[PDB]
Amino acid sequence: THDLVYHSKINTFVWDVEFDIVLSDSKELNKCYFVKCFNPYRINGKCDFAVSSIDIFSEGKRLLIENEFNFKITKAVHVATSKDVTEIVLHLSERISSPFPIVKEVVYLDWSHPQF
Amino acid sequence: YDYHFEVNGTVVRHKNKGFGYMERFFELKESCDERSKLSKKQYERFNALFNFFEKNGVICMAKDAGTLNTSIEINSLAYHGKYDVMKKFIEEQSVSIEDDYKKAFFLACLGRWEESYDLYSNIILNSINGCVYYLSQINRYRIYQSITQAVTQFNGLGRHYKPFTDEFLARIEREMTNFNIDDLFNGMPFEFQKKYKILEFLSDNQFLYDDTVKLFELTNKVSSDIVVLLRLYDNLRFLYENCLWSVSFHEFHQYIRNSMSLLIEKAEYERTRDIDELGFGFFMEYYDFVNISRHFKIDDIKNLERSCSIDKIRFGEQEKIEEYLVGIAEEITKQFSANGMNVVFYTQFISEAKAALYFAKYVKLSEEGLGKIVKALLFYFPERDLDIGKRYVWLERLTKCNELPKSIISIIDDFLVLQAEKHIDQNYSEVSSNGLYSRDYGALIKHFEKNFISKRLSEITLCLTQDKQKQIDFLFKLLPLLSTNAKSHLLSFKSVENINDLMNGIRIGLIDEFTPEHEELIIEYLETRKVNYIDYMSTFGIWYFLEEINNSKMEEFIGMDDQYDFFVDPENFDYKKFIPSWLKNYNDKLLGKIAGNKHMKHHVIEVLKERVKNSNDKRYLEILMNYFI
Amino acid sequence: CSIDKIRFGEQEKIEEYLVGIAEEITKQFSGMNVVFYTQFISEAKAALYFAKYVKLSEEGLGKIVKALLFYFPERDLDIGKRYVWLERLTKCNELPKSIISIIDDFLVLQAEKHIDQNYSEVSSNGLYSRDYGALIKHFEKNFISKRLSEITLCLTQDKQKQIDFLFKLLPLLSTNAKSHLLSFKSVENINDLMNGIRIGLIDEFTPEHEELIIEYLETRKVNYIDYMSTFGIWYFLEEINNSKMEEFIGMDDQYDFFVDPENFDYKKFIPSWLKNYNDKLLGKIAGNKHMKHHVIEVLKERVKNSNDKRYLEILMNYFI
């Protein structure tokens, strides 16, 4: 947990951990992580409200979320050390009260925007 | 040390005890009557000295100092990235050994390090004043170091490349075995070591420690800025005009980074202090732009942007900067549009091209030059450096100072059509690091052309069938760019029978207005969730808040999801259940609507005040300051 | 940064370092080495300035204050700068009896200097011995200076600077001494009016005081073709209701801003002004509803583009 960072702009965490999770349809995804992109200046449509967009990458390739992604974390594995960081992951998820408390990497698109 | 020469072109006597030869020389230069006395040989020698001093920008003594025009002018093809001219120069036959030294430097600058090393060896053979010999030895050692580092990097790192043949690598390793750069100067003829002592520093591993340590004067808070800038210009001119390869090493790049960054930060600090005192600085030019592009990584540019208000930095010589950018675009096209990609040259040049196109946001670009830059960035920029999202970020940054013209819109439409055509394969997918994809380019096009309709994308949708689903769902995110008939053709390919289909359509943009059946779908989902009580809930709460639903029956689902109740009935919500982190998720539109609700605005104001007072969070503070929620 | 919120460790070693600096101040200015002084006075000054954040014992604080007031050269510490150092020193240690006595000795010495006509106190910070007296009376509501009042009783007419000096320190005197001073010193000029309002001799402005203010403003206006800011603050505060002040707008910007908020151009507003205003004046400005939005915009710009946290504190506390 020495590489864990708390990004407060979007109250999430950056941690190099993959996740094994079971969705609401019993589907199994392995070695999946999340990438958050904080885009407040993003060109927003009528029904778009969220400030940051999250992508899911399983086995090095992203996934298209065509269904409700209600999921529960079954296992969390750290890359630098194979130690299971699950319980800490659940603790942080409970504390944060935000979607996807832990993210593989956060991409800040505010400073690279022309309007910044 | 008999005299000290200012970086602004003036001399001051110090440590000189005998005759004031510098003052006498300046007096002689000022008046030709006193010059007429000198003998013929002395007259020619004075003329040569005057040429040298004017060329090197030494004007007069401190007392004579007046309107000093200190304009930088680096006469080097390598500095301006005139790669075609450098190649032409290398192709042509070299008349002398000085042209061979220039050729070797240009070959080093073009990534042709083997040819440059061989040319340096030839110059060393044929050059034994000995100044070119010493400089060639220095540059050959530098190029050997560069080759070694490049070999190490390529061994460590996307595809396996072997720019230097193992035979050549072994030959250079044997030739440079036990080679000492420290002893190079001491081994030179004593006449050389006397005449050319000033070149000693070129044999040292570090030569910018003095210049770097003099940068602390930019961090003071109590001209230093002009001194630092002129010192940097002096170093650049000396290293480039003299064709020294150490101008490409990490030490010099870091020195330029530090100097430019500290100069900009000092200018920003002066600006803020002046605003605080008077209650309402760094003027960048072509050379500053080139230095920032070449010696700055994208991370360094981002640090500059976040630290300072670079939008307040006026950019000068913008036509020259646009010429630089267009030349970079042409070089990118040559490197990639053709098959002339040099691995060694590309490694170094891609960073400068990326930084130049990133920094171009601050420069007004002519329509034709803007089109050239845009096409080069969109099409011929390698994907291993700019992925789809990064390329979109680069492109959108260019609209800050140049409203998207029709030609640039056509270029973006061409890119979109090519992206769609690439989707015929069921395995090709857009890879983005910023999370931005082709739909983002379409959104930008509609932003600057609201009623713009893409004819070729419309046709591509009008040719789609039930088979190539990839093209189908790709064109769904490009729905606004499609025509009415194309929109109708695409819409038939998705079903909204269940709520999840509605969510997917809304996310992809299939449906933008909630039809009554959509509201009833949301309602049945709410009923099922309520029944099963003993993720989208906040989404529907926001939609009702955002006036995206006029059902007026959602209130039946109040009392289980804090965000939903908070959004449906802000007045009746108990704000002890409010989580301030919610405000960190809403975008500008939702936060502004919350602030303007005229209800619950005081609750959010007090929560934000508590957050700012207890955590000093800049995000909460900026939320409160911008929308005053 | 909020250095007052940083916990200082090894405070005893810090106090010993400060006390040693104080001893060197006493020694160098009692056998001064100019060369050593040149380098060491900067460090002593910075140490005394930064000592505001460290709690000090009575003996160490007394030594430091004595060196700062008496044996710290005026060439590097004005009277106002010396007062600033002292008031900062009181931050972590409320002025005890010993330090109060030291300040009383300093004030008595100041009065003795004023006995000579040539003496004059120069301070760039705008603070003078009256500030030291105000601090003494602030850290103890009723403070009687036996020696200052004794000097007051032995006062004569031949002294012109001494009379006003002892007048500015009236709250530290005794009943008889203050009565003699008032019988001898009459509020007749603008500076005397300011000193009386400060020490508390006058609470409300009579027509004579407003006439003095108007005469000062007339002199300034005639010449045109600190004081103005104070008059503008008073007028905006409604402490002066003469209403003839608006005749004198166009010389200094703070007066124009205070007297007529609506007509003041805000491209000439100085954010730094908001730092001088106290709590009650800040609240009056916030509630004026005439400049409130303009000062809101100024504070927003200062919170964004400035590193000073005072602007954020003001905006968040008073919404000015």
DSSP assignments along B519-566, one per residue: HHHHHHHHHHHHHHT---HHHHHHHHHTTS---S-GGGG-SS-HHHHH
Give the span between the Cα atoms of B13 and B52, in whole angstroms: 19
> Token pair 């303009």 is at which residue?
C294
Q: Closest Cα partner for C166 from C183, C154, C149?
A: C149
Give the span between the Cα atoms of B329 and B398, in whole angstroms: 14
Shortest Cα–Cα distance, B608 to chain C (Å): 10
Residues in chain A closer than 8 A to B396 (CB atoms): 113-114
Strand partners for A34: A56
A and B touching (3 or more beta-carbon pairs closer than 8 Å):
yes
Residue C316: closest C-alpha in chain B: B609
Q: Give C238-241 contacts, CB < 8 A, sequence gap 24+.
A: C239/C204, C239/C205, C240/C205, C240/C210, C240/C213
Residue B292 CB coordination number (10 Å)? 25
> Does A51 contact B584 at a Cβ distance shorter than 8 Å?
yes
Interface test with C, best of B268, B273, B275, B613 (most C CBs within 10 A): B275
Residues in chain C closer than 8 A to B280 (CB atoms): 267
User: Residue type at B326?
Assistant: V
Residues 245-284 of C with CB under 8 A from B: 267-272
Considering only CB atoms, B275 lies closest to which of C268, C305, C312, namely C305
Considering only CB atoms, B272 lies closest to which of C269, C306, C316, namely C306
B and C touching (3 or more beta-carbon pairs closer than 8 Å):
yes
Residues in chain A closer than 8 A to B618 (CB atoms): 9
SS3 for B204? coil
Distance from chain centroid for Cα B530: 52
Pull the structure tokens for residue C92: 């972590």
Shortest Cα–Cα distance, C296 to chain B (Å): 10
Residue C267: closest C-alpha in chain B: B280
CA distances from B198 to B1, B194, B195, B483 (A): 12, 9, 8, 71
Give me the helix-helix angle, B388-397 and B438-448, nearest 10°: 20
Considering only CB atoms, B587 lies closest to which of A8, A9, A49, namely A49
SS3 for B57? coil
In total, chain C counts a number of residues equal to: 320
Pull the structure tokens for residue B460: 């591509």
Q: Judge contact between B108 and B123, C-beta under 8 A.
A: no
Q: Among positive and negative, which fits the CA dihedral B616, B622, B626, B629?
A: negative
Residue B343 CB coordination number (10 Å)? 14
Q: Judge contact between B50 and B100, C-beta under 8 A.
A: no
Neighbours of chain C (3+ CB pairs under 8 A): B
Experimentally, how was this structure solved? cryo-EM
Note whether A45 contacts B: Cβ–Cβ < 8 A: yes
Pull the structure tokens for residue C279: 């709590």
Shortest Cα–Cα distance, A54 to chain B (Å): 8
> Token pair 């000439």 is at which residue?
C268
CA distances from C85 to B64, B195, B246, C1, C118 (A): 46, 58, 52, 19, 26
Residues 229-248 of C with CB under 8 A from B: none
> Does B625 contact C316 at a Cβ distance shorter than 8 Å?
no
SS3 for B167? helix
Residue A54: closest C-alpha in chain B: B435
Strand partners for A28: A22
Cβ-based neighbours of B234, under 8 Å, separated by 6 or more? B7
Residues in chain B closer than 8 A to A104 (CB atoms): none
> Does A107 contact B585 at a Cβ distance shorter than 8 Å?
no
Pull the structure tokens for residue B552: 């007026």
> Does B275 contact C272 at a Cβ distance shorter than 8 Å?
no
Give the span between the Cα atoms of C316 and C256, in whole angstroms: 26
Note whether B609 contacts C: Cβ–Cβ < 8 A: yes
> Does A112 contact B539 at a Cβ distance shorter than 8 Å?
no
SS3 for A31? strand
> Does C269 contact B275 at a Cβ distance shorter than 8 Å?
no
Note whether C303 contacts B: Cβ–Cβ < 8 A: yes
> Does B586 contact A55 at a Cβ distance shorter than 8 Å?
no
Strand partners for C230: none
Residues in chain A closer than 8 A to B399 (CB atoms): 114
Considering only CB atoms, B535 lies closest to which of A52, A68, A97, namely A68
Continuous segment of H or E residues that includes residue A103:
strand A102-103
Neighbours of chain A (3+ CB pairs under 8 A): B
Note whether B221 contacts C: Cβ–Cβ < 8 A: no
Residue C274: closest C-alpha in chain B: B276
Q: Closest Cα partner for A4 from A91, A75, A71?
A: A91
Q: C287-313 burial, b for 16+ CB within 10 Å, e for fewer? A: ebeebeebbbebbbebbeebeeeebbe
Which strands, in side-by-side order, build the sheet including B3-5? B3-5, B10-13, B60-61
Give the span between the Cα atoms of C271 and A67, in whole angstroms: 54
> Does A51 contact B536 at a Cβ distance shorter than 8 Å?
no
> Does B500 contact A70 at a Cβ distance shorter than 8 Å?
no
3-state DSSP helix/strand/coil percent for chain A, to nearest 5?
Answer: 10, 40, 50
- Please list every residue in chain B followed by a chain break, i.e. its C lies more than 2.5 Å from the next written N: 128, 157, 222, 280, 534
Distance from chain centroid for Cα B317: 18
Q: Closest Cα partner for A51 from A62, A36, A40, A37?
A: A40
